[PDB]
Amino acid sequence: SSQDIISRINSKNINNNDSNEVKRIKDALSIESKERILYPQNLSRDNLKQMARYVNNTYVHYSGNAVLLSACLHYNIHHRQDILSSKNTASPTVGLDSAIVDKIIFGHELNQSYSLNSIDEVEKEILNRYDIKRESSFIISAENYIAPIIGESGHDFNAVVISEYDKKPYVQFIDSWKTSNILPSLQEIKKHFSSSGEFYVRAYDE
Ligand SMILES: [Cl-]
Ligand code: NA
Ligand code: NA
């Protein structure tokens, strides 16, 4: 599947209004294809921390862009391998659309949920999907995430359902961009939102 990403990134069939965005992705993205030991089928919380650390290969003093980081991490989780990572030096906020990122990484726009009104409701929706279909990995899009200095802004992050021995499955939120706290608790991540709340969930399906 990594070779498909390479084919799409380099293709000539791109509207030149998108070519700058695609060049930004190309410059940021690294693809490690060497055959290595996979992560386990049943992921641990520790596995998620290692995966989140891997995707964010930005230079010191650069933050990268959450839309690209979250897509990379989602892709890696899906394949149970550290394949994609970002060294993006471009803006954390502007110049990357989730639609273009999804087309590049996954080969299509991912289907988004209906809008959810709180991170609590996100958690419940994800647990519902896990209960019914055992869907366990998602990209979360938030409309009014409070980022340092800039304030309310769109933000993408991840969530994975972790199933530990003899414990109820729980949602682990993962924010590979927020390197101060890459595995926030619900309570912690809620601090970054006021009531101005809108969230969407999406996931890659093969
Ligand atoms: Cl910014
Ligand atoms: Na950095
Ligand atoms: Na935090």
Residue numbers in the entry: 8 to 213
Report text from the authors:
Interestingly, conversion of the SpvD sequence to that of the Enteritidis strains increased the activity observed in the DUB-GloTM protease assay. To explain why the Gly-161 polymorphism leads to greater activity, we crystallized an inactive (C73A) form of the variant in the presence of RLRGG-AML substrate. Although density for the RLRGG-AML substrate was not observed, we were able to build additional loops (two of them near the active site) that were disordered in the previously obtained SpvD4CS/R161 structure. To map a potential ligand binding site on SpvD, we superimposed the catalytic triad with that of the UCH-L3 ubiquitin hydrolase crystallized in complex with ubiquitin. The position of the superimposed five C-terminal amino acids of ubiquitin (RLRGG) is unobstructed in the SpvD4CS/G161/C73A variant (right), whereas in SpvD4CS/R161, binding would be impeded by the side chain of Arg-161, which restricts access to the active site (left). Modeling of the RLRGG DUB-GloTM substrate onto the Arg-161 or Gly-161 structures provides a rationale for this observation, clearly showing that the side chain at position 161 forms part of the active site groove and that an arginine side chain here restricts access to the catalytic triad. When compared with the Typhimurium SpvDA154/R161 variant, SpvD with a single polymorphism (Gly-161) was more potent in (i) the DUB-GloTM protease assay, (ii) inhibition of the NF-κB luciferase assay in PMA-stimulated cells, and (iii) virulence in mice. Furthermore, we demonstrate that a natural SpvD polymorphism significantly affects virulence and NF-κB inhibition in PMA-stimulated cells, leading us to hypothesize that the substrate hydrolyzed by SpvDG161 might be part of a signaling pathway involving protein kinase C.
